[PDB]
Write a protein that binds this ligand. Structure first.
Ligand code: HEM
Length: 184
């Protein structure tokens, strides 16, 4: 179960965040015990496509090889805070699991600049939530976390030392598929 009302960044710049480009997860923190694997990778694209606010997600377990993509339309709750009902798709946007009530995530942009971001998500999927999940993002998949985003982690009353890095998993991303999925 999720327990945090994450606060969106003051002055959040939606058009810069949702510019159609890719964000890589470099570090993550799940508040719940062994909610997610210790070794993981993930990335997303975020943009407006034909007037609609969209995200495309990619998940890959580097040990089991489990791979999936998602597309969602984001609804606005407030500046930087969204509710997303997702559909599981292949990399080409063909639907594998349709949108359904009960399958949604919330998404809060706590900090962002042109290169880095801190987000919170709460996943709801039928019978399961995946507890509060924080993610440090970068435009460069290999970037070490800089002072702006590390300071934002501190300002959220979190300890960056507890975040788990994704960097040592050899993950490789299809950033072309992520961008194209925004339209699907
Ligand atoms: C970057 C932000 C992230 C968002 C918005 C997000 C969102 C989601 C969504 C919507 C699903 C369900 C997809 C489907 O069934 O079609 C999912 C599943 C999952 N995510 Fe994330 N995720 C993100 C990052 C992560 C990270 C960094 C981990 C870390 C380990 C992670 C681990 C998982 C796991 C293991 C599942 C499978 C859950 C299951 O079905 O039991 N996610 N995520």
């Amino acid at each position: 179960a999720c327990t945090k009302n994450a606060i969106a960044q003051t002055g959040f710049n939606k058009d810069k965040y949702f510019n159609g480009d890719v964000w890589y997860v470099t570090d993550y923190l799940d508040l719940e015990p062994d909610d997610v694997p210790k070794r993981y990778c993930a990335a997303l694209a975020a943009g407006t496509a034909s007037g609609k606010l969209k995200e495309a997600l990619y998940h890959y377990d580097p040990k089991t090889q489990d791979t999936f993509y998602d597309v969602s339309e984001l609804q606005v709750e407030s500046l930087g805070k969204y509710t997303a009902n997702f559909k599981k798709v292949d990399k080409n946007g063909n639907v594998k699991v349709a949108v359904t009530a009960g399958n949604y995530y919330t998404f809060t942009v706590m900090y962002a600049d042109d290169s880095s971001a801190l987000i919170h998500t709460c996943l709801h999927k039928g019978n399961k939530d995946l507890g509060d999940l924080y993610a440090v993002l970068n435009r460069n998949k290999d970037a070490a976390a800089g002072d702006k985003v590390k300071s934002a982690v501190s300002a959220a009353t979190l300890e960056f030392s507890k975040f788990i890095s994704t960097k040592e998993n050899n993950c490789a991303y299809d950033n072309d598929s992520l961008k194209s999925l925004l339209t699907k």
